[PDB]
Paper text:
Ub can be ubiquitinated at any of eight primary amines (on the N-terminal amino group of M1 or the side chains of K6, K11, K27, K29, K33, K48, and K63), and all eight Ub linkage types co-exist in cells (Peng et al., 2003). Affimers are 12-kDa non-antibody scaffolds based on the cystatin fold (Tiede et al., 2014, Tiede et al., 2017), in which randomization of surface loops enables the generation of large (1010) libraries, against which epitopes can be screened and binders can be selected. To understand the observed linkage specificities, we determined crystal structures of the K6 and K33 affimers bound to their cognate diUb at 2.5 Å and 2.8 Å resolution, respectively. Both complexes show a conceptually similar interaction between affimers and diUb: each affimer molecule binds one Ub molecule and the affimer dimerizes to bind the two Ub moieties of a diUb in a linkage-specific manner. The variable loops are responsible for dimerization as well as Ub recognition, and specific dimerization provides two binding sites for Ub I44 patches with a defined distance and relative orientation, leading to specific, high-affinity recognition.
In the K33 affimer, the mode of dimerization is different. Both variable loops extend the existing β strands, which leads to the formation of an intermolecular β sheet. Ub interactions are mediated by the elongated β sheet and are centered on W105 that contacts the I44 patch. Additionally, E76 forms a salt bridge with K6 of Ub. The structure also indicates how the affimer could bind to longer K33 polymers. Interestingly, whereas the affimer-bound K6 diUb does not resemble previous K6 crystal structures (Hospenthal et al., 2013, Virdee et al., 2010), the affimer-bound K33 diUb superimposes well with reported K33 diUb crystal structures (Kristariyanto et al., 2015, Michel et al., 2015). The latter also closely resembles a conformation adopted by K11 diUb (Bremm et al., 2010, Matsumoto et al., 2010), suggesting that the K33 affimer could be cross-specific with K11 polyUb. ITC measurements indeed confirm that the K33 affimer also dimerizes to bind K11 diUb tightly, with affinities slightly weaker than the K33 diUb but still in the low nM range. In contrast, the K33/K11 affimer is monomeric and only dimerizes upon diUb binding.
Numbering used by the authors:
A (entry chain C), B (entry chain A): 1 to 74
C (entry chain B): 33 to 121
D (entry chain D): 32 to 121
Write the structure that this text describes.
Amino acid sequence: MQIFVKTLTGKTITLEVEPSDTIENVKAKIQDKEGIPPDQQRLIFAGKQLEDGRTLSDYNIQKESTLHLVLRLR
Amino acid sequence: MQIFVKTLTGKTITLEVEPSDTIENVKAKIQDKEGIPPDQQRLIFAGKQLEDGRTLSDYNIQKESTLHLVLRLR
Amino acid sequence: NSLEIEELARFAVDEHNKKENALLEFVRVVKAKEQIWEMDASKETMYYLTLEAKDGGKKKLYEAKVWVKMTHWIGAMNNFKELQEFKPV
Amino acid sequence: ENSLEIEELARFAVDEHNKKENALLEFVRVVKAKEQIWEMDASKETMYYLTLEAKDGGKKKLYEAKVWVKMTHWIGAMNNFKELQEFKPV
């Protein structure tokens, strides 16, 4: 399925993912596309921070869902 | 000298620099420090976006000055 | 709302002024239309404002385009706005 | 006297606390308000120390909120970020 990732200014990228994928794996996908390391990535969905060990289906992240990304600098 | 780089959420890193240094060189300093690639770095100071070819002194960035960083996703 | 738009219109003018050292007086909002995208944890709005401002004390018409993204999560919310276009008729 | 913004921040603290715990505290007033501000280039960082009054079970009680606000501005663009960092009873 397809999902969107946005910064707080509205910059948007799109990733092709599966509900089985982990948050840990999605952050890897973002690094491969954009070069931002996962240790710098805070992912938001459903008014919550996403845990790396957890998968997309746990957070009920369906198709065409939008995640937001905040830089950690740490 | 020392300067600060902050995200829009207030996350802060510190870089040791010289007024001779270019904006290009600072993004490299950030890349080496944080792992964020320079093509993703939009640096803001004195109400302006900083161009890579210019130096810190051109922008009047003295000691203890604070720059801000916005992710480009590009 | 009308007042919220007015702040955006002023924002467009003051920011335009800063970028050109342009000396515009703000008079009123003439038309206002918006495009909104609604997603999880955010509302994105593009404002198409036609405002009237004085250049030399004579009122004139300008087109402003202001981008606003509001993003919120538990315990936090962020509001970002940007002037994207400012042009005469 | 800049009070309404404090009231909004206090309410933000209450609703966000509520959203996070599902607690429904009803906001009555701000009792005390102190803030720490850092001034830098293109930004103003403020930490709000709010003491507010809220009804837990219909009985008013006192709570300490801490709201973090960072405002960043540059030509053509403005950003406002706020965060609830602490919400605790006395």
